[PDB]
Write a protein that binds this ligand. Structure first.
Ligand SMILES: Fc1cccc(-c2cnoc2-c2c[nH]c3ncc(-c4ccncc4)cc23)c1F
Length: 332
């Protein structure tokens, strides 16, 4: 008996099945480690989640588990296993086990220059994965390079469905969020495409006002139609108080980019969410012609829906629902 496993002064109780732990990353209420699975004889990714002190954290944990266990797609991360305590009174943490990928798009863009063919293939896989998510009437709401996992052969998977809802990181947030619909994910994909083209975030604001200023600095001052929606009074009056800003052509920001990539980028980074390109039209765009294949782009059989009103349930009821949902991965 070795006792419970530990990583950087905190318990990571995944043994005896998962051993030889190595720290990967950390979040506000969760740590990610790689581990050796002695059953499948392969290294896996394990996320420790400690959400029971807050109702919102419990909601996100339950939403992610239910969505990922239901979803089955090549470009979406699956859940292989879930570890938690034998009794609800002892359950203070939840460990989700997933495939261990090589890296993420955040790390790849920090150290590698991407060829147009690699940008095209990654964009294709993101939209193919998004086509499946959106067909299930689910919004990811937090697409960004760190949520895009890559294997050695350049295959891509979308992860982190904690903020997903039935129909976030500031730099990839759609202007209407700051001013939610399926179109908010297309914006985020637009921001990721622009980042793949230059290895730099296109709208790197320090705060929400600086974010809007970064967006207007490239798209130009918004029109009357762009602003007239169910917009926040302060945000509207602020945008109206700003001096005129000229639109910066895409070929001026990305002078060495493929003209087809910039035409698609234009349609994804449209201020008005109603005029923004939808996932099926984006896949069919001439930029993705080499990879577009509607015969091999699966969709969800039916739209996703939660049986209960998760927002209204007390954290103690959500703790019970998490215990019940994770019971199928327990022995017996
Ligand atoms: F729910 C889970 C369960 C296990 C891990 C995660 C998670 C959260 N953020 O990335 C991951 C990863 C899942 N599989 C992975 N494989 C590799 C990497 C990784 C990232 C950066 N450098 C190297 C490896 C991350 C993950 C997760 F969301």
């Amino acid at each position: 008996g070795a006792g419970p496993e530990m990583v950087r002064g905190q318990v990571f109780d995944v043994g005896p099945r998962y051993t030889n732990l190595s720290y990967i990353g950390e979040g506000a209420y969760g740590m990610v480690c790689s581990a050796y699975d002695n059953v499948n004889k392969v290294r896996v990714a394990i996320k420790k989640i400690s959400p029971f002190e807050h109702q919102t954290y419990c909601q996100r944990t339950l939403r992610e588990i239910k969505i990922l266990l239901r979803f089955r797609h090549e470009n979406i991360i699956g859940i292989n296993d879930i570890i938690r305590a034998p009794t609800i009174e002892q359950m203070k943490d939840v460990y989700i086990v997933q495939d261990l990928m090589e890296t993420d798009l955040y790390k790849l863009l920090k150290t590698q220059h991407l060829s147009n063919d690699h940008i095209c293939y990654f964009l294709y896989q993101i939209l193919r994965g998004l086509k499946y998510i959106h067909s299930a009437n689910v919004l990811h709401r937090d697409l960004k390079p760190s949520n895009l996992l890559l294997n050695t052969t350049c295959d891509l998977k979308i992860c982190d469905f904690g903020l997903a809802r039935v129909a976030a990181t500031r730099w990839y947030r759609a202007p209407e969020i700051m001013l939610y619909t399926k179109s908010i994910d297309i914006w985020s994909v637009g921001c990721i495409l622009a980042e793949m083209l230059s290895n730099r975030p296109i709208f790197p604001g320090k705060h929400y006002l600086d974010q809007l200023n970064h967006i207007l600095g490239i798209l130009g001052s918004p029109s009357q139609e762009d602003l007239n929606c169910i917009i926040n009074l302060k945000a509207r009056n602020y945008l109206l108080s700003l001096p005129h800003k000229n639109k910066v052509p895409w070929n001026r920001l990305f002078p060495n980019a493929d003209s087809k990539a910039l035409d698609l980028l234009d349609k994804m980074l449209t201020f008005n969410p109603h005029k923004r390109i939808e996932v099926e039209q984006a896949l069919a765009h001439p930029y993705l012609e080499q990879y577009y294949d509607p015969s091999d782009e699966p969709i969800a059989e039916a739209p996703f829906k939660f049986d209960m009103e998760l927002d209204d349930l007390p954290k103690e009821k959500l703790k019970e629902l998490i215990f019940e949902e994770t019971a199928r991965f327990q022995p017996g």
